């Protein structure tokens, strides 16, 4: 069981931003992210690497095609590892 996957599972309810394999950055309140990081969320605002925009009331994010995940600073305060 992964510590980063666990932090991601916790990330539900807070803001999450996802850089994809193509390099787009999407932001939204994370609902449920599985062990395989398949992030099925809602109200995603995604900006593409060239500057174009897009937004959806819902979104799905395949796991193996995730480039990065940045959450709000609520997490920075599990330290036992």
């Amino acid at each position: 069981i992964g510590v980063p996957i666990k932090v991601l599972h916790e990330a539900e309810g807070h803001i999450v931003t996802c850089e994809t394999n193509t390099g787009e950055v999407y932001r939204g309140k994370l609902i449920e992210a599985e062990d395989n990081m398949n992030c099925q969320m809602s109200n995603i605002t995604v900006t593409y690497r060239d500057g174009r925009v897009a937004q959806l009331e819902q979104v799905y994010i395949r796991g193996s095609k995730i480039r990065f995940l940045i959450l709000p600073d609520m997490l920075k305060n599990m330290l036992k590892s």
Binding site: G2, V3, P4, I5, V7, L8, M37, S64, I66, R67, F68, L69, I70, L71, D73, L75, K76, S81
Partner: protein, 84 residues
């Protein structure tokens, strides 16, 4: 078995399989290379080692930066752990 948890809690710059040089405080290693970094910066344009003209540029703020093992490329020690 300490290959990550030895410098864990330390600052390190890890180059991704895409190339961004993310320098931050290591939050945990992983069997897959599942990595987390707190107080995170990422470098794209250059990595400063006494760069007189510029040293901190093409720098994105990540903060909590959680990356998986697929996008893991290389690691080096870059920072001493924050006393926080």
């Amino acid at each position: 078995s300490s290959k990550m948890l030895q410098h864990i809690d330390y600052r390190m710059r890890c180059i991704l399989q895409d190339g961004r040089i993310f320098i931050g405080t290591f939050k945990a290693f992983d069997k897959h290379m599942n990595l987390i970094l707190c107080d995170c910066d990422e470098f794209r344009k250059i990595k400063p080692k006494n760069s007189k003209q510029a040293e901190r540029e093409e720098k994105r703020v990540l903060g909590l930066v959680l990356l998986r093992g697929e996008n893991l490329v290389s690691m080096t020690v870059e920072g001493p752990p924050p006393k926080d």
